[PDB]
Amino acid sequence: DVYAQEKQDFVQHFSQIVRVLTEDEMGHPEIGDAIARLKEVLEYNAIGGKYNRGLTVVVAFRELVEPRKQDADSLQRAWTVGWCVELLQAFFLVADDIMDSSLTRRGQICWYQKPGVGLDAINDANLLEACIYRLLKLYCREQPYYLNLIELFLQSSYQTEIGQTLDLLTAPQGNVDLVRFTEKRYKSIVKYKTAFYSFYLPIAAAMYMAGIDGEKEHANAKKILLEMGEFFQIQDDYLDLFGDPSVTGKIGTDIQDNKCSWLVVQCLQRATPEQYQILKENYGQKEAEKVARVKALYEELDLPAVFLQYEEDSYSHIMALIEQYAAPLPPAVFLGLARKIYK
Amino acid sequence: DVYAQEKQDFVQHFSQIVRVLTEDEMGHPEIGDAIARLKEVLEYNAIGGKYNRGLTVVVAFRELVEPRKQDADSLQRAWTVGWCVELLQAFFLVADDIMDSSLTRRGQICWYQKPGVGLDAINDANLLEACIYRLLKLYCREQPYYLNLIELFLQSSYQTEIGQTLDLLTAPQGNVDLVRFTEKRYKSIVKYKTAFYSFYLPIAAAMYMAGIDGEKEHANAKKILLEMGEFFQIQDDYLDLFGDPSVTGKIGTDIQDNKCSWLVVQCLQRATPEQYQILKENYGQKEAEKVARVKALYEELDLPAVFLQYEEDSYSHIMALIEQYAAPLPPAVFLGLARKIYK
Ligand SMILES: O=P(O)(O)C(O)(Cc1cnc2ccccn12)P(=O)(O)O
Ligand SMILES: O=P(O)(O)C(O)(Cc1cnc2ccccn12)P(=O)(O)O
Ligand SMILES: [Mg+2]
Ligand SMILES: [Mg+2]
Ligand SMILES: [Mg+2]
Ligand SMILES: [Mg+2]
Ligand SMILES: [Mg+2]
Ligand SMILES: [Mg+2]
Ligand SMILES: [Mg+2]
Ligand SMILES: [Mg+2]
């Protein structure tokens, strides 16, 4: 992949990110303990993933910016902005893990589950968020795209938070109403909670850094990226139940948490009234036997096979959107991302 | 007060703030339920306070901007930016109430304690934060001070979050070490957690709106405002134990929560080794009888009288700093604020 060609170098740069964020300390040694906590938080929560969102900024930048304009400082700004995307993810995930009552993330216990962390993780997440704007000021403040990037991160955060609200509102604890789990509702939740920040944000950041600021170009980019994001969230929902946690790094909670998962939507489209009652009886509950019954029902209704077919159809659709909407950007910008997510 | 002269009108404007924030809905009716939740969150959490921070932007604006430049639109931008300060407070308090295990706020149950809210309040707080940047874009994007304000809110949030980290790190649950509760540590915690966002932020916002952007003018302003903020937090700590909750609107938790309160710092400065052991035995614990013992010890050591004296000395000090540092701004800018907090 073009992603493996940039990864080791991207990751390498995290030590610099941490160093520049945790040297607000000469000048202000009274905040030392707080900066030590920030370092711990950064190291626990922004490292251990695949780095695909941050890497996408870097790879897109190199593909959109003329090689004679890819000087040392410009490349550094590019991987800084990719790390800002990673930090945005880190902030959101820390908070999400608490609100979803999750156990593990990236092959370790969730930050909030750590003895001695707990709900202090809320402020830790806010700090991760603040680091984004700190790095943008330190590295990009004199660039013509500075305000574009600040506003792109802010707006992406707002959209994401709106999607989180829909997610949580459609999934009330102890309150099983399957009636709300429609395809239309599903598409809206995932557009807001995932598609903007996971797909549109990183490419858009690289577009703005390359001086591509036009509303038409950004709107065309979105046509591809929001669709890619929807697929990505459907995949996430499928892996929540059917994925191997040694590979995914995380234990699923969607059934217990009463979530408007792609799986439950597809279940409802297919289920006889008898299967509907089974689903109603067992969904949204902590008991392991009830979760098992839901999984059994999904397997009975061939949902893994339905997912496999959906992934093929989706891949073909996204490739079609690249043919329609890529120009004037290099198709490789989107195809690389397609390759990474449809693996 | 100059604050009462602007309050009814300031509060009046909240209906407009809510209307403009909850009409992201024509165009995007798929987010309707989320926008309904945002309205609920806004109404519960940004209304019911004294509005002093938001009001300070408005009053300072009128005192710093030439009356011929105080047109309809400019006044509207001023009360919008004051509401942004209120929203910053609202975001921070929702999160703080969870992390401090608080019960009530502004004479009602804390948002997170509401049946059916719970830890979903984390995302609600993030949404309140997003509304700040939304209102600044909608109302101030074409103004020469736009980036100044965005960066002032972002930086104030970072500082505040650093202060929150110090607060929480100095107050580990179930872990009583009084050794860390020093005056030096106290001053650092409150500078970061309170002084920036409660005092410096609102005046600074009005300064930038009035085209007063000079580093020397902002640095002089800070000399007064950070000191005022320290006093304000000492007052907050005193009222945590000795205030009337029908007046304060909130039930105190500092002793239970093992906080580096001004009260405990002053206790440690004065306490015999026998009183030190009593404090060690009873601090940072949930039992009502142990909290009562700590309060008894404080009363034994005349801490209310010590606070009364401190408030006089502090008032005199801040007035001295106004004489030194107010120019070239009208002294009324600071004196009005002094009047409100030393009441
Ligand atoms: O927990 P994961 O990794 O399975 C999850 O995929 C995480 C996720 C998706 N979108 C957002 C937005 C903000 C915070 C977290 N987000 P989900 O949406 O299923 O919680
Ligand atoms: O709960 P209160 O109102 O007594 C409290 O005064 C609230 C407070 C002060 N400073 C901050 C910063 C962020 C969030 C809340 N903050 P405290 O600092 O004592 O928690
Ligand atoms: Mg989750
Ligand atoms: Mg979630
Ligand atoms: Mg998931
Ligand atoms: Mg879940
Ligand atoms: Mg508190
Ligand atoms: Mg607190
Ligand atoms: Mg307090
Ligand atoms: Mg407390």
From Swiss-Prot, chains A, B:
Its cofactor is Mg(2+). It comes from Homo sapiens. The keyword Acetylation applies. This is Farnesyl pyrophosphate synthase. Homodimer. Interacts with RSAD2. The lineage of its organism: Eukaryota, Metazoa, Chordata, Craniata, Vertebrata. It is linked to Porokeratosis 9, multiple types: A form of porokeratosis, a disorder of faulty keratinization characterized by one or more atrophic patches surrounded by a distinctive hyperkeratotic ridgelike border called the cornoid lamella. The keratotic lesions can progress to overt cutaneous neoplasms, typically squamous cell carcinomas. Multiple clinical variants of porokeratosis are recognized, including porokeratosis of Mibelli, linear porokeratosis, disseminated superficial actinic porokeratosis, palmoplantar porokeratosis, and punctate porokeratosis. Binds 2 Mg(2+) ions per subunit. Isopentenyl diphosphate binds at residues 50, 53, 89, 106. The chain holds residues 74 to 416 of 419 of the full protein.
